[PDB]
Write a protein that binds this ligand. Structure first.
Ligand code: OGA
Ligand code: MG
Ligand code: NI
Ligand code: ZN
Length: 331
């Protein structure tokens, strides 16, 4: 069995290997990459996403979100307070202000220590889930707006044609902006490209061990767990690496830098934080191997998770027994 310790693997494809996206994902899996839940892909030196980032300041962040924490430094939830619209140039200025800017630090490990010590005492503002793309239309390789759609994959594997679309999303971050512990909708894959700016640190639990994280989360967030049998779908709970280690939860960590891709694999729980002002692009995708995970994915039906239009068909076809309860939670 390849990668039996479930380490995060880093890949350096050649320009020739960068042509066929599906083939390369399958290659990474042949080497055991999925066992970690997360892999890094460093593009060949010949590749670029676009020519420059000099002309992005006029993108609008219609609903910036202030991430307010509650709890203790290593075990907390966050809620998202809506703020007034601002442009990417305005948001960049805010991220660099004395109130929000990255503090002085020695290295990524020192900054990680500072994050976990101090995160809860601040409320950073995140531009999330902005439909759009920064890939140039002429970028032919690993262009996240030109991937094969999940609806086409389901039709190819299973024979059923379904409604829905699959487009990318932009994220504008600042110091301490946080992504809570989660798997993807319907336990899909994700791919994330860090277009510019400061790093993103990731934590991940191997898919084979995801239920260990879920059991800890139920213990640590006992009211939330009574409220919903899949409350991590709410995407609000944080648990630090120190707390994970104290509770024996298997996990790994890695820092993504500008110009690098990360892939999350089906049922790979992940969480993390941004080091400073940055911009990332991400999208969900599927392969044949996903279908069995989609059939078994948990679902939130309490009303909190609320998701895209295109998840309806996935539940309807892959999980017909759950569909009526889930759809009630959507309405
Ligand atoms: O970068 C972020 O805030 C969160 N991204 C992801 O969870 C992802 O790409 O799957
Ligand atoms: Mg612009
Ligand atoms: Ni994710
Ligand atoms: Zn719920």
């Amino acid at each position: 069995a390849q990668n039996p310790n479930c380490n995060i693997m880093i890949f350096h494809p050649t320009k020739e290997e960068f042509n066929d996206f599906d083939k390369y994902i399958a290659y990474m899996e042949s080497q055991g990459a999925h066992r970690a839940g997360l892999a890094k892909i460093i593009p060949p030196k010949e590749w670029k996403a676009r020519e420059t980032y000099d002309n992005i300041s006029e993108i609008l962040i219609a609903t910036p979100l202030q991430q307010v924490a509650s709890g203790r430094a290593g075990v907390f939830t966050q809620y998202h307070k809506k703020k007034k619209a601002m442009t990417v140039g305005e948001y960049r200025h805010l991220a660099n202000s004395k109130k929000y800017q990255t503090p002085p630090h020695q290295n990524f490990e020192d900054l990680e220590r500072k994050y976990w010590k101090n995160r809860i005492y601040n409320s950073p503002i995140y531009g999330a889930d902005i439909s759009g793309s920064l890939f140039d239309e002429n970028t032919k390789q690993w262009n996240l707006g030109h991937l094969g759609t999940i609806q086409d994959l389901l039709e190819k594997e299973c024979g059923v044609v379904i409604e829905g679309v699959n487009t990318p999303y932009l994220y504008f971050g600042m110091w301490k902006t946080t992504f809570a512990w989660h798997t993807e909708d319907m336990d899909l894959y994700s791919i994330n490209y860090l277009h510019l700016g400061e790093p993103k640190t990731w934590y991940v639990v191997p898919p084979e061990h995801g239920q260990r994280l879920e059991r800890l989360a139920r213990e640590l967030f006992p009211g939330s767990s009574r409220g919903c049998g899949a409350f991590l779908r709410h995407k609000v709970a944080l648990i630090s690496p120190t707390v994970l280690k104290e509770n024996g939860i298997p996990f790994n960590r890695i820092t993504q830098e500008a110009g690098e891709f990360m892939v999350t694999f089906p049922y790979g729980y992940h969480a993390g934080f941004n080091h400073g002002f940055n911009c990332a692009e991400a999208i969900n995708f599927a392969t044949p191997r996903w279908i069995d995970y989609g059939k078994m994915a948990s679902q939130c039906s309490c009303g909190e998770a609320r998701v895209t239009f295109s998840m309806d068909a996935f539940v309807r076809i892959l999980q017909p027994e759950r569909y009526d309860l889930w759809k009630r939670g959507q309405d």
